[PDB]
Write a protein that binds this ligand. Structure first.
Ligand SMILES: Nc1nc(CCc2ccccc2)cc(=O)[nH]1
Length: 330
């Protein structure tokens, strides 16, 4: 089997991407944030505290003839950015772009943190990291991709995120028309439960390539590109007037600047992130100070190849016996 679904930026800055998902019988379609950096499929629901729901589409398990409460099971997650959610668990039928899993764990939110309430565009998360990170207790549950994998034509999914435009998640096949040149595959460690790999280095604009190992994660659920302070300083030094602001919480730059590109290495291959991808717009409405899309990973403890990086590539999440990641230009 295979599946294919379009993924859409939630706003004009590509702050996150949503993908429609069918849950239950009859289908209830929710727009979920496909997150290769976490491993819970959770949704806003009929059970979510009423004051914590503000425009999201909710899953109502009582209206699904295939929903079954998973006895005694609860979940609670806290993300890298400080947001959180928790609740109980059903198993139900879940489909993505024509691909169906029966008995998928659907984690129904009883509580969500304020950032989720405040964003009406995201109805929940669909985790695509390794199932070892799933938070369901006392019996850990499998991700959508883990459940689907055996049935897929090939045990893979791909992320093709758009810059200011729709993109695609495919399951079970590689669309050879969706990228240019070849796909370069690179080793993955699953020891932290992430798609963790090692970049071979970087370049800033037309500058020469610096060969240096950067360990990090391919994370569709993180918006920005988080890299070591030395690398991030080298980037922003090329932007006149750019400064790290402790009050804002990162590098900001004059909105009138034209930003240089940033290149990262995958083996001998190179993925080029155009300068415009790094512009996250005014820090507050009407400001002429803009927020940078490349930020220091210092004190978050891990480098993160988030959407800023991934949207410059066609990305293969290869779930073979020994997982690997592939990157191509596009
Ligand atoms: N990998 C990853 N996932 C999340 C998911 C939660 C989320 C979703 C949209 C906006 C804000 C928070 C948060 C995070 O920091 N990293």
């Amino acid at each position: 089997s295979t599946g294919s679904a379009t993924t859409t930026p939630i706003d004009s800055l590509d702050d996150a991407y949503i993908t429609p998902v069918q849950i239950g019988t009859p289908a209830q379609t929710l727009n979920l944030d496909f997150d290769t950096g976490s491993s819970d499929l959770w949704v806003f629901s009929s059970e979510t505290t009423a004051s914590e729901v503000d425009g999201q589409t909710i899953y109502t398990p009582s209206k699904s003839t295939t929903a079954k409460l998973l006895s005694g099971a609860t979940w609670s997650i806290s993300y890298g950015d400080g947001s959180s959610s928790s609740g109980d668990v059903y198993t139900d039928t879940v489909s993505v772009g024509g691909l169906t899993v029966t008995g998928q764990a659907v984690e129904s939110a009883k509580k969500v943190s304020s950032s989720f309430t405040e964003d009406s565009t995201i109805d929940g998360l669909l985790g695509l990291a390794f199932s070892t990170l799933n938070t369901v207790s006392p019996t850990q549950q499998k991700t959508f991709f883990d459940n689907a994998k055996a049935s897929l034509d090939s045990p893979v999914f791909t992320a093709d995120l758009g810059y200011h435009a729709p993109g695609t998640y495919n399951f079970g096949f590689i669309d050879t028309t969706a990228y240019t040149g070849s796909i370069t595959y690179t080793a993955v460690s699953t020891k932290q439960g992430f798609w963790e790999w090692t970049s071979t280095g970087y370049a800033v604009g037309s500058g020469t390539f610096k060969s240096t190992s950067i360990d990090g994660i391919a994370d569709t659920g993180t918006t920005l590109l988080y890299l070591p302070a030395t690398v991030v300083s080298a980037y922003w030094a090329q932007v006149s007037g750019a400064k790290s602001s402790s009050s804002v919480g990162g590098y900001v730059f004059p909105c009138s600047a034209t930003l240089p590109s940033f290149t990262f290495g995958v083996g001998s291959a190179r993925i080029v992130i155009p300068g415009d991808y790094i512009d996250f717009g005014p820090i507050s409405t009407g400001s002429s100070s803009c927020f940078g899309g490349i930020q220091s990973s210092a004190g978050i403890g891990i480098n993160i190849f988030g959407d800023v990086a991934l949207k410059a590539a066609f990305v293969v999440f290869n779930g073979a016996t020994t997982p690997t990641l592939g990157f191509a230009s596009k």
